[PDB]
Amino acid sequence: VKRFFESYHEVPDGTQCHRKTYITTALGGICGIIGSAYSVSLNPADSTLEAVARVGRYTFTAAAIGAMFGLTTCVSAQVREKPDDPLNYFIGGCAGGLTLGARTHSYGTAAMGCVYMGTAAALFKIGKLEGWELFPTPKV
Amino acid sequence: MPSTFFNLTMAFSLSLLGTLMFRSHLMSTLLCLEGMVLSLFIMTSVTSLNSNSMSSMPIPITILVFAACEAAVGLALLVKVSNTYGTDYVQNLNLLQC
């Protein structure tokens, strides 16, 4: 999965949009599996049928988050012809937020997701442009 | 020795996974804890005998004594649970949530 995750970054944005959507969908799926496992273990369902139904619901929701994020980001980058720009990631994160609000069926959650995920995606894009270390090895 | 040590580490891993996945019996949980203890004793003893480390063969004796006193403490706690609730079911132990 390693070469997969840094194979998202081997191509410039606005190019290989289907591939970028597939990798971001896979990342969202893994995050949804982790969150669903935590949900069904901390808060157990009444039976295994609705337990695995909750797992599938969370996984599909987060996979849709990743799919909409990757598709919106790559489409915006290619239609505005400037890949190294955080606003593409802001629009993609906002589209993911509207996707989360549609899955939750709440426009308030849509607005939360849009603003917060767009800000997070913009900061992530800035970090990947200009070298922010999220987990740096000790140096001093 | 590497195959048998791998088998011992997988035995410890299985006992740990059994400890982490609770059932209705705190006795079974304590038995899984001593499955881990026994696996630790065999790995320490085989390592000491393979390395001829006569200075460190007391270490299995110390792990046995210390883990046995720890399990005596745990058995006393399970006795207290069985006395207050009739049984040793771990789902009876849940009123500290609030």
């Binding site: - | 390395s51 001829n52 480390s53 006569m54 200075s55 460190s56």
Partner: protein, 52 residues
């Protein structure tokens, strides 16, 4: 260790059986005694990073 009471008082409560090439009963050498002695003799006095 985190605290050096053993080094301050000069006692050796548990420092004399740290490794295989340490003191042994009736001078029974452990396996790789020479190799571990060579490693410790190399690594002493230069720190962990330079030892690595």
């Amino acid at each position: 260790p985190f605290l050096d009471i053993q080094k301050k008082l000069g006692i050796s409560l548990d420092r004399h059986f740290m490794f295989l090439s340490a003191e042994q009963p009736y001078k029974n050498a452990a396996r790789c005694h020479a190799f571990e002695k060579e490693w410790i003799e190399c690594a002493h006095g230069i720190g962990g990073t330079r030892a690595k």
